[PDB]
Amino acid sequence: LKWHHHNITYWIQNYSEDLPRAVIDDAFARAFALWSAVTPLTFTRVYSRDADIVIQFGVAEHGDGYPFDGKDGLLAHAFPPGPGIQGDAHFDDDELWSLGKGQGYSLFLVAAHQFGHALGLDHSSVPEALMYPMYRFTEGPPLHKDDVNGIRHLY
Amino acid sequence: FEGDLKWHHHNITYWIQNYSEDLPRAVIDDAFARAFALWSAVTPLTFTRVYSRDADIVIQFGVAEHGDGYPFDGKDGLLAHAFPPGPGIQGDAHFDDDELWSLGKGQGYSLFLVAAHQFGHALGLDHSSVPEALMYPMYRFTEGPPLHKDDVNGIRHLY
């Protein structure tokens, strides 16, 4: 299951109260940049519901039939490629979002993982691969050779 | 802002007078605490957070002219400044809030790394000549351990 076009679009519907708009826009862009670096895909920011990947921050019940569970636990979730809600990525705003070393969760790293799913990737079994199902902070290049092979296999 | 005195006690106290609007107070408290930890790890010094003006190191975020006689210059340029050990304003650290404060890779400047540098001055350290050193006068983002051997030797020499 994957996208049939390579010029993918995204829409940042809203923001979190934890960080400045500029920091959030940048974090999402750098996250998309990791993937386009190893594939023929490109990512374009738009401002309408016509975008392939719609990004949203929410708490508890927020629309779909999948409410978040308050602080900690599930950090976020996304859907596989397709029309409508498919391909979208949502982030639990009951979590403390930040960047780098320190308390709170890295928005940059979590976004990179969520976008992996929105592109068609599944969970990895390599505990050190980005697509590994459990959160873990890391410095340096985020994508493990397992992630790179997985995306290249699809696109 | 380059004196020649050190602190005569090792139980240093600090007070976070106010905050920046760019990050949650919890993220800021944590960033400052981790910054001080860098230095207490390689010396016999300790740092205690207090809530009165009687603290040795008072931390403040300001815009343009903010009290002393050295106003900030708006976005970019001078990021922050601190004063050498001593009484009153001496030892304090000020951050320019016209800057976009953040953490890690990305746009904006790392509050963590800049604080580490300012606290170095607040402890008595001068500027280094080694490009890789934290006390180097130019801002540069880096991952991994912030303190260079030059910084470690410099602090141990005083304390």
Ligand SMILES: CNC(=O)[C@@H](NC(=O)[C@H](CC(C)C)CN(O)C=O)C(C)(C)C
């Ligand atoms: C601290 N919580 C977790 O690690 C949590 N896992 C998640 O929230 C996953 C995303 C992280 C790896 C970025 C959920 N996910 O698979 C999203 O697509 C659990 C407590 C292990 C469930």
Ligand SMILES: CNC(=O)[C@@H](NC(=O)[C@H](CC(C)C)CN(O)C=O)C(C)(C)C
């Ligand atoms: C981006 N701006 C700079 O690198 C700026 N340097 C500073 O503001 C120094 C602090 C940085 C290294 C955290 C000022 N300082 O030495 C304070 O004690 C210059 C453009 C190089 C002046």
Ligand SMILES: [Ca+2]
């Ligand atoms: Ca949660």
Ligand SMILES: [Ca+2]
């Ligand atoms: Ca969609």
Ligand SMILES: [Ca+2]
């Ligand atoms: Ca939040």
Ligand SMILES: [Ca+2]
């Ligand atoms: Ca952090």
Ligand SMILES: [Ca+2]
């Ligand atoms: Ca400035």
Ligand SMILES: [Ca+2]
């Ligand atoms: Ca003082």
Ligand SMILES: [Ca+2]
């Ligand atoms: Ca600011």
Ligand SMILES: [Ca+2]
């Ligand atoms: Ca950053």
Ligand SMILES: [Zn+2]
């Ligand atoms: Zn959802």
Ligand SMILES: [Zn+2]
């Ligand atoms: Zn996942």
Ligand SMILES: [Zn+2]
């Ligand atoms: Zn000042």
Ligand SMILES: [Zn+2]
């Ligand atoms: Zn300096």
